[PDB]
Symmetry: D2
Subunit: 158 residues, 4 copies
Amino acid sequence: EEASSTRGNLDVAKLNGDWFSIVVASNKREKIEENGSMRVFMQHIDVLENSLGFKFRIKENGECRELYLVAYKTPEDGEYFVEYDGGNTFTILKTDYDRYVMFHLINFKNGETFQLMVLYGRTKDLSSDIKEKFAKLCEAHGITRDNIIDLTKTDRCL
Amino acid sequence: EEASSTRGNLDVAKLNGDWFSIVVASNKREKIEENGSMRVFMQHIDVLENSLGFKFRIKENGECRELYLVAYKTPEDGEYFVEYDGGNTFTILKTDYDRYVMFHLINFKNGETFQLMVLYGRTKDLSSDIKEKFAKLCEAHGITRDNIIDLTKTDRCL
Amino acid sequence: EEASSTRGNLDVAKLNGDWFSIVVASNKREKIEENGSMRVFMQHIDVLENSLGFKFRIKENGECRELYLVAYKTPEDGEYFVEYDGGNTFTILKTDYDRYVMFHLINFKNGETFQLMVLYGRTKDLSSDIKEKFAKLCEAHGITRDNIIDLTKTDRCL
Amino acid sequence: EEASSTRGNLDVAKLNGDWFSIVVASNKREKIEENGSMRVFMQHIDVLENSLGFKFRIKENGECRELYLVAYKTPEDGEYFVEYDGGNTFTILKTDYDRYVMFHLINFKNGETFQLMVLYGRTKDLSSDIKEKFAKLCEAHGITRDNIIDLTKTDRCL
C-alpha cells in the first residue's frame, strides 16, 4: 500500500488520475493563506515522460484561475523540479495510491527558502486518521500545528 | 580567483559574458561525440533572475543550429536544473571568472543517468595547464582520460 | 451544435475532455506518416487560462511517448500558437462539441510552411458522414484525398 | 538602410546585439507607466532558430529584475509570438539596423487587446528626428501623443 519516492519503492504510474487538495501546511503561512501562491486546489495529476503534469485551480483576486504545470524528474532520488513562484524541489513523501498522497516541497526565491507539505486525496475529503498522520509528519519537519490548514472547510474553487 | 557554487563562495554575477567550449568529458562517450546532444559549442552565458541563460550552437545533421536554454536555481546548494535531453542537474565546480569555468552535470532520462563535465574558456582556447587540472577532475569523478574530448581542434560551429 | 473559432461563435469551454485522433490530412504527407511529427494520437484537451492544454501520444521509434503541450490564444480571431516542430498557428474550424472537432493548422520551420488538418472525435471512431464532411474541407484547403489518412485503422498507441 | 518584417525585406540577422529602450507608446497608458508590465528596459536581442531572444530589465516594486523571453516566428508574414502578460503578436515595423528598430505589438488577455509600439536604439538615446518619425507612426496607429513616453529621461534600470 504505502510507497515513497524518497524511500525508492514508489510506482508513480499509479498516481495518475484525479486528486483533491485536503490539507496544506507551511511555516511561511502567508503562502498557504488567502491569496497565497501555494494555496492551490489540485484537480488531476498526469504521468508523462520523465515528468508529472498538474492541473489545478487557484483563486487569484476572487477569481478561480485554471492552470497546469509540468514538473521534471531530476537525477537525485525522488526529486522533481517545477518553476512556480521560484524554483521548487519536491518529493513524494507517502502514498497508498488510491486514497492519499503526501508531497514535501522546498521553495527558493531571491535568496530565501521555505518548506511546504500537502495532502491530496482521491476524494473531496479524507479520513480523520489520514489527517493526523499528516499533521505529525508536518511537525516532524518543523512545521507547527498552527500552520497546518485544512482546505476541506473552505472553497476549493469547486 | 577560484570560487565554486558547491563550495558556496561563488559570485555567479561575474560569469556573465562570452564563453567558448574547450573540453567536454563524459563516460557515456556517445553523447559528447559527433551528433551527440551534449557536444555543445557554448557562446554566451547570461545571468538572470534566479537562473542562467545559455546561448550555444549545436551541429544537428551537419547544420549548426542556434539555441538558448534557461537553467533554474534549485533549493540545494549550487544546483541548477535545465530540461535538455532529459532532466539535468549541474553545478559550478571551479572558476577563476575571467579565464575558465568547469561545470559538472548529471543527466536523467528514462531510468538512466550519466555524468558530464565541461571546461569553458573566455578565449577560443586555454592554457595547457588549465586543461590538465580539468583532466584530473574528470578522473576524480570516474571519467577516464579516453572520454575527455578537446573540442578546440574541431569545428565548434564557428 | 456547430461553432467555430474563426466564425467567432465557439464556446471553447465545452472542448474540455477526452478526444481521439480519427483522421489527419496534410499535403506534406511525410509529416502525417509513420514516424511523422504531426502523426499525433490525441487523448485529452484541457481548457486553461488564455490557452489550451493537449495531452497526446506519439510513436517515436516504435515507442509510444506521452506528451503535453500548451497552446496560447493570440490577438487574432480564433488563432492559437504552439511551438512544436516549428511555429504553429491553428484554429478551430468546426465543432459540434460532443462528437467532433476539426482543427486547421499551419506550420513554419526554417523558411518553410505547410497545412495540417485533423478530425478529433470524443469516441474511438466517428460517423462515416463526419469523415466525409472533413474529407471535403481538406479538399477545400488544397489537401488532396491521397493525403487524408484515417488513423482509426492503425495503432493509435492504445 | 530601412527594412521591415511586414514589408518583407528585413534581414533579422542584423538585429543581433545590444539595444536600449528609448520611447514606448500605448493608448492603454497604465501598461507603459510606472509598475506597468510593458514598461520594459531592453538590453540585448539574440537571433536564434526560428525565433528571437530578448534580455531586458523591469522594475518590479522598486527592484530591477533581469528577464529573458523567447519569441517564435509564426506562419503569417513578419509575425512573432511571445507569451507575456497575455498572448502577444508583434512585427518589426521599421529598422535601419545600426541605429533604431520600431516594433509594433498587440496584446490579448482575458477577452481584451491593446496596441504597443516601441523604439529601440543601439545607443542610450537617439536622434530627435528618429523620435519624431516614431511619434508619427504612433499617431498613424491610433496612439495619441499623450501616450508616447520617452524613457531616456527616467531610470532604465541602468
